[PDB]
A paper describes a structure:
GDF-5, like BMP-2 and BMP-4, binds to and oligomerizes two types of serine-/threonine kinase transmembrane receptors, termed TGF-β superfamily type I and type II receptors. Whereas BMP-2 binds to both type I receptors—BMPR-IA and BMPR-IB—with similar affinities, GDF-5 exhibits a 12-fold higher affinity for BMPR-IB than for BMPR-IA. This type I receptor specificity of GDF-5 is due to a single amino acid, Arg57, which is located in the pre-helix loop of the ligand. Mutation of Arg57 in GDF-5 to alanine abrogates type I receptor specificity completely, whereas the mutation of Arg57 to leucine leads to enhanced binding to BMPR-IA and attenuated type I receptor specificity.
Structural studies were performed by crystallizing the binary complex of GDF-5 R57A bound to BMPR-IA and determining its structure at high resolution. Although a full complex—one GDF-5 R57A dimer and two BMPR-IAEC molecules —was observed in the asymmetric unit of the crystal, the backbone of the ligand–receptor complex was highly symmetrical, as shown from the superposition of the two GDF-5 monomers as well as the BMPR-IA ectodomains. Analysis of the two binding interfaces formed by the homodimeric GDF-5 and the two BMPR-IA molecules yielded a total of 18 intermolecular hydrogen bonds (H-bonds), suggesting that polar bonds play a role in GDF-5 type I receptor recognition and binding. Upon binding of GDF-5 R57A to BMPR-IAEC, the backbone atoms of residues Phe97 to Val104 (finger 2) and Lys29 to Ile38 (ω-loop in finger 1) of GDF-5 R57A moved up by 5.5 Å towards BMPR-IA, although residues in the very tips of finger 2 shared no contact with BMPR-IA. With regards side chain rearrangements, the largest changes were observed for the two tryptophans in the wrist epitope of GDF-5 R57A; Trp33 moved downwards by about 4 Å and Trp36 rotated from a highly solvent-exposed conformation into a position located above Trp33 thereby moving by almost 10 Å. In complex with GDF-5 R57A, the α-helix of BMPR-IA formed similarly as seen in the complex with BMP-2, consistent with the observation in the study of Klages et al. that small changes in the environment result in spontaneous α-helix formation. Although the structures of the ligands as well as of BMPR-IA were almost identical in the different complexes with varying binding partners, superposition of the complexes of GDF-5 R57A:BMPR-IA and BMP-2:BMPR-IA revealed that the orientation/position of the receptor ectodomain in its binding site differed between these complexes. From this comparison we determined that the membrane-distal part of the BMPR-IA molecules swiveled towards the N-terminal end of the GDF-5 R57A α-helix and further into the concave wrist epitope, whereas the membrane-proximal half of the receptor swung out of the binding site compared to the receptor orientation observed for the BMP-2:BMPR-IA complex.
Residue numbers in the entry:
A (entry chain B): 31 to 118
B (entry chain A): 16 to 120
The structure:
């Protein structure tokens, strides 16, 4: 089911209209860690629209760059989120 | 990483060589949409399921599946007063003239 209202933290993925580094949505908040070329990693986070979220929130084991996304469904649930990479 | 978003695009009917036939306005802001559409596709990008699938596949093998594209997903009208009719004056509202939002499709 869709969520009338969900408030999430964002970083890297903030809408143009973000305030206090937060975004609104009807789907999920996410946090993602992804690994760069020299093996450097960034964490980023934002809001995910409901439609498409069952596909985006599960992760393809076959991504060309190792990464982990996590989704949750309560206000600000992604602040303080630390997914770690799949074990090498 | 500059991600899919609305950028400024100024239309000026004189530069277009259209000042001969458009009476008003002289110019408006139409905006345009440009930028990466990468995994993951955040909420304001409002992807279709297809855009999600294709993006995922492109994330898996970019040689084999190209990226989805940043494009207007919501627009608004502009009304233009012009001639062109063997010079009979005419008022017309044109839909989809100004980008209000961008997303990946």
């Amino acid at each position: 089911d869709t969520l009338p209202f969900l408030k999430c933290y964002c970083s890297g993925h903030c809408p143009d209209d973000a305030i206090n580094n937060t975004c609104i949505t009807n789907g999920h908040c996410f946090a993602i860690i992804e690994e760069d070329d020299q093996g450097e990693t960034t964490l980023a986070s934002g809001c995910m629209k409901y439609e498409g979220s069952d596909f985006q929130c599960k992760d393809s084991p076959k991504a060309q760059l190792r990464r982990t996304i996590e989704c949750c469904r309560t206000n600000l649930c992604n602040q303080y989120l630390q997914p770690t990479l799949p074990p090498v | 990483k500059a991600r899919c978003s609305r950028k400024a695009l100024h239309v000026n009917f004189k530069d277009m060589g259209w000042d001969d036939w458009i009476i008003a306005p002289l110019e408006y802001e139409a905006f345009h949409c440009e930028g990466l559409c990468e995994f993951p596709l955040a909420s304001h990008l409002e992807p279709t399921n297809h855009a999600v699938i294709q993006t995922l596949m492109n994330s898996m093998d970019p040689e084999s599946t190209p990226p989805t594209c940043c494009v207007p997903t919501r627009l608004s009208p502009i009304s233009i007063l012009f001639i062109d009719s063997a010079n009979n004056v005419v008022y017309k509202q044109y839909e989809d003239m100004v980008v209000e939002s961008c997303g990946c499709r």
